[PDB]
Amino acid sequence: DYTAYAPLTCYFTNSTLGLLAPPNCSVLCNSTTTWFNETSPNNASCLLTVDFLTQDAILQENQPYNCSVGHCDNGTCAGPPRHAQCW
Amino acid sequence: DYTAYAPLTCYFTNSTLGLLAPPNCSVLCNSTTTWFNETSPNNASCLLTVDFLTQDAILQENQPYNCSVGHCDNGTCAGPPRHAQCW
């Protein structure tokens, strides 16, 4: 395993429009040694809103839900929103 | 662990200028279910060349090495090159 490849694991939301960055276009990542944020690239798909009854998350319900998707614009998620299903 | 975050692990080269995409600006990634390539964003740091005696890699030597770094431009790594150390 000479000069082995460097894995980077980053954490997204699953959706019908693919993996989404958060609304602030900053993704949590982990190298072999560290946890840090990386700014999403401009035009990456990002979560704008999540559209379920707030109490469902308080009850930690493990069910898919309606969400809206935008694109990253200079470190913030921008609309106009598109519909998607998130889980 | 309700609607758990979706991890994506992608594989880079370590360097003194940070994690590098390959010269073709296409990164191997793994979701919880699949292996696939993702195109690097424009202006991501990428490996242009590796500057060691070819036989060293044939001998699978696990040593750091001089490399040159560029930036992704429309799916290919572009110069001008900057020096870095890779491992």
UniProtKB/Swiss-Prot annotation, chains A, B:
Main location as per UniProt: secreted
Result of changing T3A: No effect on binding to CCL5
An annotated Gene Ontology molecular function: C-C chemokine binding
Gene Ontology CC annotation, any one: extracellular region
Annotated glycan sites: N14, N24, N30, N37, N43, N66, N74
UniProt keyword annotations, A-Z: Disulfide bond, Glycoprotein, Secreted, Signal
Subcellular location, record wording: Secreted
Subunit structure: Monomer.
Family: Belongs to the evasin C8 family.
Function summary: Salivary chemokine-binding protein which has chemokine-neutralizing activity and binds to host chemokines CCL1, CCL3, CCL5, CCL7, CCL8, CCL11, CCL14, CCL15, CCL16, CCL17, CCL18, CCL19, CCL21, CCL22, CCL23, CCL24, CCL25 and CCL26 with nanomolar affinity. Binds to CCL3 and CCL5 with 1:1 stoichiometry. Although binding to CCL25 is observed, does not inhibit CCL25-induced chemotaxis. Has been shown to reduce cardiac injury and inflammation in mice through its anti-CCL5 activity.
Record's comment describing the protein's domains: N-terminus residues are involved in complex formation with CCL5. A N-terminal derivative peptide composed of residues 37-54 inhibits CCL5 activity in monocyte migration assays, suggesting that Evasin-4 derivatives could be used as a starting point for the development of anti-inflammatory drugs.
Protein name: Evasin-4
